Amino acid sequence: MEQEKVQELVSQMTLDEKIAQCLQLSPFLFKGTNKNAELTGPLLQEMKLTDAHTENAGSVLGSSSALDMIGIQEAYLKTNRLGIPLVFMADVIHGYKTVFPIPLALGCSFDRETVRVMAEVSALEATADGHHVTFSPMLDLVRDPRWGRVMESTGEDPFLNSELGKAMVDGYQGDASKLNENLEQMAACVKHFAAYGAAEAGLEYNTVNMSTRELYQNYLPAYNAAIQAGAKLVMTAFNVVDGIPATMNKWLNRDVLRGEMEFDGVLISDWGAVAEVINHGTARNPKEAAQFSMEAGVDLEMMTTCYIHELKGLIEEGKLSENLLDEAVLRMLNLKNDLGLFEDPYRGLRTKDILTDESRGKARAAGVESAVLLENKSRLLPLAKEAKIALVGPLATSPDILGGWNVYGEEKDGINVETGLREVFETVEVVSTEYTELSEEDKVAVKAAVQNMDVVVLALGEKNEWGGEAGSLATIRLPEAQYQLAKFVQTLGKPVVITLFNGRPLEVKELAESSDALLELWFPGTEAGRVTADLLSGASNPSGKLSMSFPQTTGQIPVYYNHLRTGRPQTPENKGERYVSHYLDIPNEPFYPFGYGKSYSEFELKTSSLPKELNLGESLHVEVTIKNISDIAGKEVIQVYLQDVTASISRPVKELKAFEKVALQAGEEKTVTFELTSEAFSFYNHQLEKVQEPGLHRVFVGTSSEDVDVFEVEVGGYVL
Amino acid sequence: MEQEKVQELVSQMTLDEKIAQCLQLSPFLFKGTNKNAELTGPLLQEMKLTDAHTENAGSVLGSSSALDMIGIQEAYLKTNRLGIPLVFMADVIHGYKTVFPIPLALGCSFDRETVRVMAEVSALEATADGHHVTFSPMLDLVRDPRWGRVMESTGEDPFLNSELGKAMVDGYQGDASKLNENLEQMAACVKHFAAYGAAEAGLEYNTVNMSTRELYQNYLPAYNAAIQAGAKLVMTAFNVVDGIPATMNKWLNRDVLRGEMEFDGVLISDWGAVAEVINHGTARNPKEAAQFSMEAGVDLEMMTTCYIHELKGLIEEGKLSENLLDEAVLRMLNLKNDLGLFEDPYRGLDRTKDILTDESRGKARAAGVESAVLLENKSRLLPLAKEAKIALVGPLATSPDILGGWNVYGEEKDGINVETGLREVFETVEVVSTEYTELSEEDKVAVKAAVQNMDVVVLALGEKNEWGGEAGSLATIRLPEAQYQLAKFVQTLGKPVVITLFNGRPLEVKELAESSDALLELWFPGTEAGRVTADLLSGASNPSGKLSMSFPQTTGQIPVYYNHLRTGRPQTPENKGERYVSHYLDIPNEPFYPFGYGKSYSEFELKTSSLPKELNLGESLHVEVTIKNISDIAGKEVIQVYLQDVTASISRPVKELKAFEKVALQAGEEKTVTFELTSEAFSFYNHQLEKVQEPGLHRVFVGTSSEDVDVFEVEVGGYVL
Numbered sequence A: 001m002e003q004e005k006v007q008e009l010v011s012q013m014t015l016d017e018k019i020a021q022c023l024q025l026s027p028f029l030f031k032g033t034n035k036n037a038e039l040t041g042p043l044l045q046e047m048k049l050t051d052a053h054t055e056n057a058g059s060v061l062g063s064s065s066a067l068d069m070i071g072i073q074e075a076y077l078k079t080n081r082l083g084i085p086l087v088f089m090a091d092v093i094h095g096y097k098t099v100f101p102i103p104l105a106l107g108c109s110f111d112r113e114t115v116r117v118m119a120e121v122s123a124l125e126a127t128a129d130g131h132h133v134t135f136s137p138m139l140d141l142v143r144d145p146r147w148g149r150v151m152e153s154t155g156e157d158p159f160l161n162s163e164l165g166k167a168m169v170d171g172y173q174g175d176a177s178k179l180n181e182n183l184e185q186m187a188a189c190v191k192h193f194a195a196y197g198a199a200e201a202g203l204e205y206n207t208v209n210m211s212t213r214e215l216y217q218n219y220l221p222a223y224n225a226a227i228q229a230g231a232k233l234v235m236t237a238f239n240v241v242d243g244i245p246a247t248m249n250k251w252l253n254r255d256v257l258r259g260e261m262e263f264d265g266v267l268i269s270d271w272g273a274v275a276e277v278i279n280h281g282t283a284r285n286p287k288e289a290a291q292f293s294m295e296a297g298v299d300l301e302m303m304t305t306c307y308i309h310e311l312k313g314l315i316e317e318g319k320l321s322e323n324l325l326d327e328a329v330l331r332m333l334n335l336k337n338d339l340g341l342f343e344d345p346y347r348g349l350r351t352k353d354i355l356t357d358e359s360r361g362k363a364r365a366a367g368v369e370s371a372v373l374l375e376n377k378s379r380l381l382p383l384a385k386e387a388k389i390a391l392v393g394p395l396a397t398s399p400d401i402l403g404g405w406n407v408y409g410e411e412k413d414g415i416n417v418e419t420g421l422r423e424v425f426e427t428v429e430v431v432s433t434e435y436t437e438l439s440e441e442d443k444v445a446v447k448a449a450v451q452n453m454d455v456v457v458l459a460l461g462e463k464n465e466w467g468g469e470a471g472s473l474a475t476i477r478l479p480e481a482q483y484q485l486a487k488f489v490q491t492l493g494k495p496v497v498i499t500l501f502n503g504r505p506l507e508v509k510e511l512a513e514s515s516d517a518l519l520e521l522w523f524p525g526t527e528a529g530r531v532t533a534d535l536l537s538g539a540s541n542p543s544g545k546l547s548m549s550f551p552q553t554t555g556q557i558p559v560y561y562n563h564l565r566t567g568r569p570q571t572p573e574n575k576g577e578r579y580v581s582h583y584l585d586i587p588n589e590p591f592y593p594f595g596y597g598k599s600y601s602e603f604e605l606k607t608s609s610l611p612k613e614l615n616l617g618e619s620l621h622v623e624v625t626i627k628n629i630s631d632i633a634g635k636e637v638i639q640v641y642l643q644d645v646t647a648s649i650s651r652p653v654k655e656l657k658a659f660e661k662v663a664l665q666a667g668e669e670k671t672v673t674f675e676l677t678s679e680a681f682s683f684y685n686h687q688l689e690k691v692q693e694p695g696l697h698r699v700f701v702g703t704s705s706e707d708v709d710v711f712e713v714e715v716g717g718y719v720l
Numbered sequence B: 001m002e003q004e005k006v007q008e009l010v011s012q013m014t015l016d017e018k019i020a021q022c023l024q025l026s027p028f029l030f031k032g033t034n035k036n037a038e039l040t041g042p043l044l045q046e047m048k049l050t051d052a053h054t055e056n057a058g059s060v061l062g063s064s065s066a067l068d069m070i071g072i073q074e075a076y077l078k079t080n081r082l083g084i085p086l087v088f089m090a091d092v093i094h095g096y097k098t099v100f101p102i103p104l105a106l107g108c109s110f111d112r113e114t115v116r117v118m119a120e121v122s123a124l125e126a127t128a129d130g131h132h133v134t135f136s137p138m139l140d141l142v143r144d145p146r147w148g149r150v151m152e153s154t155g156e157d158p159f160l161n162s163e164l165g166k167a168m169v170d171g172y173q174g175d176a177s178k179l180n181e182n183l184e185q186m187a188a189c190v191k192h193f194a195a196y197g198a199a200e201a202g203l204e205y206n207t208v209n210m211s212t213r214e215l216y217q218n219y220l221p222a223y224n225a226a227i228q229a230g231a232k233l234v235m236t237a238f239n240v241v242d243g244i245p246a247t248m249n250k251w252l253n254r255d256v257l258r259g260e261m262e263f264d265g266v267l268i269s270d271w272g273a274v275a276e277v278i279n280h281g282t283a284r285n286p287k288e289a290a291q292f293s294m295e296a297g298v299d300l301e302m303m304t305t306c307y308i309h310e311l312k313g314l315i316e317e318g319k320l321s322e323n324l325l326d327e328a329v330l331r332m333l334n335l336k337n338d339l340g341l342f343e344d345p346y347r348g349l350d351r352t353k354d355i356l357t358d359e360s361r362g363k364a365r366a367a368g369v370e371s372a373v374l375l376e377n378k379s380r381l382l383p384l385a386k387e388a389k390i391a392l393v394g395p396l397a398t399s400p401d402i403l404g405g406w407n408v409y410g411e412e413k414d415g416i417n418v419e420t421g422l423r424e425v426f427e428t429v430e431v432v433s434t435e436y437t438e439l440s441e442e443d444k445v446a447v448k449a450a451v452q453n454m455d456v457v458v459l460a461l462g463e464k465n466e467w468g469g470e471a472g473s474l475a476t477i478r479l480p481e482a483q484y485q486l487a488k489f490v491q492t493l494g495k496p497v498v499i500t501l502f503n504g505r506p507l508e509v510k511e512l513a514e515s516s517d518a519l520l521e522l523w524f525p526g527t528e529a530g531r532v533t534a535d536l537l538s539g540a541s542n543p544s545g546k547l548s549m550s551f552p553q554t555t556g557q558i559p560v561y562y563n564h565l566r567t568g569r570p571q572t573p574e575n576k577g578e579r580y581v582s583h584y585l586d587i588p589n590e591p592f593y594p595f596g597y598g599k600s601y602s603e604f605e606l607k608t609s610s611l612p613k614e615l616n617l618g619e620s621l622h623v624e625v626t627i628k629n630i631s632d633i634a635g636k637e638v639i640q641v642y643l644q645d646v647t648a649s650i651s652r653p654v655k656e657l658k659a660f661e662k663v664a665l666q667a668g669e670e671k672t673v674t675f676e677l678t679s680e681a682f683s684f685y686n687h688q689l690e691k692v693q694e695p696g697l698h699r700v701f702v703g704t705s706s707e708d709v710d711v712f713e714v715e716v717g718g719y720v721l
Ligand SMILES: OC[C@H]1O[C@@H](O)[C@H](O)[C@@H](O)[C@@H]1O
Pocket: A091, A135, A191, A270, A271, A469
């Protein structure tokens, strides 16, 4: 419908209707719900909610199905005074029913299109089940793998996360101006604003602190790219940002989000994050929490009642302008409009779209794009279809391969490693073991299965509940039984491939040392076993690269490729000296660096002549010719980094600024060109200006952060 | 001499002498030294230095003795156009020749007098050997025990570090206006400005980053307290502060240090820190390093030559005002003047008499017994009867490496090891010494034999000092693994076990506490370690130290500290076991041992007098504490008072230490102490960098650690005093 009819709706709304429009609730607090009606009475009492509240609530979160939504919406509209329909939101994080690889794994794809297709298939399926908005992408920069939520990020690089973030928004929303028409597309909600992934010591919900310059330089960019790409909503974060809970942080949400980033959509609190400003000790009670959160431009409170119980009194007492509320309601109604709910409150409600063969194939291709081959000694992999396999370990038969933040996908639809492998390989013998134990009986069985076979596939992993939200690990290791199992299997004299399943970087040196190959599958989602089989057999050729550094040990954290030089860099020419930046007990380098990944193919790259000089404001075009010098078809991820050698601020040794995954047949050669605009050469200075300084830059072209050729360019002269 | 002549001296110096005055060199680069003269020619040449340079250099660091100094100063004065003497600086960090406990152990003393005595003794001995300045106190807040340099700090509390830092300055300098009169006193140099201990991942020299509010709230106070207490010098830090190396950080050094902190003394670069801004990538060459460093107000370049090879060109070309140079030189000459070096360039110099005396040694012992921390003592194993038969086993049994890191002048041959220490007090001791990093089958047979005979094991475990200090970073804060196996083995021998731990950082000690009956943390006590150990074990001294740094559950809990924020989902005893709260799946949130924790052989009872329920803004809270030793044994308790601001415009720490006093109490004896928490103690830096006091609720915690406390509420409001 048209904007004046919206604007009118705000004017026609009572104060209480407006307040309640600023409330989001779980599906089973509404009448009409097809599930959990036995939780409804106790919780409605606990939250002190009325029919008046629930009949005028803005939004539902976490409906279980199309029937739940239809049911809640049909009933809500029966008794809603103005017929303002409900907006329905869900966690569609890396798939709805067809589960794709976890987002950290998607990061390792280095493949924008894989990311977009994931998001599109997710939207197609979720819209089919009645949801209007997904709480995705998660755009928190992560340098600390203790934190469970690293599984949700695409890793430690702001540029990669910004690029994959846009791919996700594009995937979920298509053309955002047509969301009222493209009812297979849905609204994306960027989270968590801001800097949540810098949680101190990897401890969930823990303190975050960085200078404002680092916030802008490294922590803000991906949120901003997703916003500029059209993301419809933003969610606040649980953490303090410079002492102040993001949720009630006026500078962050008014000056930065709405001011500088020009975001004019709905800001939704994370779960109870409004009431929780009370725990953080920046509000004395719900009245202050509501006041401060509303001043900050938080439009929709998720599952708490500070607003519904306090906004009226604050407005009536003059402590809070009713203009702020009206602005909030307006943003709510606009989102409903943009979604086309005023014409179809059921947004086209499609079962035939859910869990298709086509989608499953796509999730599988996503899996094979995302896995990272870390070791492959003496060409153990790929295996011949007739290698006799002993498949052992806790991930041999576990159905837990879909990953964390899988709210809707079902393990019964998933394909386990045993099933995947039996499809491909004639002889497979399987000994399954527990996640956290290694019994004598186990060892006897393993020995018996390995004696018979020619290769061990040693499938190790985390349970997914050891990560995700409030899944913090102080020590980033598998249970010790898994390392002992790898130590044991290794003594059996047969070649060993470790298929690792997990949601975070782990200490994997003892795994790499005890095996001939190491394949990092993360959690591939619904087609895990097949993803695994194809890669093992060579039907697919591994092509993923690490989007997050694998530390030598827990105590190296944080370690990350784009680091400062320090005043005493360890060089190769001073290594061994005492007074340089180093540790007594481990290398400075991570066990595996950012951008690292092996292939069954072999490539060579060639960078065309670059200019020696460039003007300020001018783009650097980088041309790369790549050839597959092997007999095997494969993909390579070309990466381009830049360093600013000297600057008014100490600048990272390398920053990723472009990348492209290139598919190549045997013998085949392609050419790609990259534009590094002058923005790539820019940075925030001590005064928070985005600036470009004349001076020397190094450009690195290669296939990891360490496998690169270096070139120099002098920037100066005039500005374009 | 008169300010007026100092002034004149500046007008009378050439440009080249003015520049050289801002250079600091090792002794063996000067004519007249009596050690290492064979390094002089190669190094003078590598640094491109000339007679003109060295003959006019401002300063020496690291002279080896009184004779070194006298030789060098004699030669320099003979050839120096205007007779401007050298100022001689050294690292006198926790003692000169009488080695005292490492500063982290001194922090555990929670004892201001102990710290001042340490410094006074240090100053006595060092002035005796010709040194004018000490590069001490080290006032870097630490939360990361991976970092080697935690040994040099007094811990994770800004208030403790501020208090003790003042005590150090007082001890070294006494009356800072009389340093030209009191020649057994010396100039202190606060370091490292600023925030160097926050190095990322405990990696040496590594990136530091925090919001400016946190800089002010937690990282700056101790530097400021020492400066306000009259520290004569300040040294820059190696790290970036908000992206910019501290040494060329104009805001940090001109605006904060000289502006807000009113510091008008000599600002000395850390070692090579001026040239190293080039490595940090904020200066293209020595010319830029020198310019940016002089703009930032660095007066004295330690052992690099940017200023020396570049200041002239910068000044000549108009890139840099000569007035800055004049200002730097004036501060250099003022310091020399304050040290009385224009009247007496040899600063009172035969004083061997004063070095390593018996009285000083007792002082260091007392410091050691003040600083050790008793962590476990199950069923009163300690103190031991003098007739107890002791199996003394481990790498610290006989190691002479007990003086600690940052001991540049102390000699292990004067130190007392644990064996010698114990043989003085206990009649029966059998000793099985083992290596730091190994445990052989042969060792185990030998340990088994010694333990079967004796009544108790004194299992002495520890770090080499080289595993800490500068560029001694450990990713994993653990002893070598052989030592944990030795503890584990020894526990199976059926006899009671005390572990005497010697180290320079918090370590993972849960396996040590679990494998023994008592655990005594000695850190590195210094020259008298053996005796410090014996007196505490035997009960001639009663342990009384408290932890000034949290001991983590495991390496990956780092950073963990008592003065932490609540978060939005604090783990409470009511929500325990719930999934969605701030917690780890694999460890507790609490450190294994918390700040302010320490056991005693005595036992104490505290009661806080009634506190007002309400307070005006600007008003002090007087806190009166009656403490009673209720046991038969004489001892000290450390009373501790913390404050929390329950609600504020910034999320505030759940607790902050605001006062403390160590109280000596004879058996049965009772005392009353009172503390004033001024309104500054209720104040904090707000998002706009204002120090503010906000009306509202506080909690006051009175007790004997950060966790053993009674809690009281006070409402602040109304009007302002
Ligand atoms: O599921 C609702 C929301 O729950 C919160 O606890 C998480 O922080 C969000 O990422 C999530 O979207």
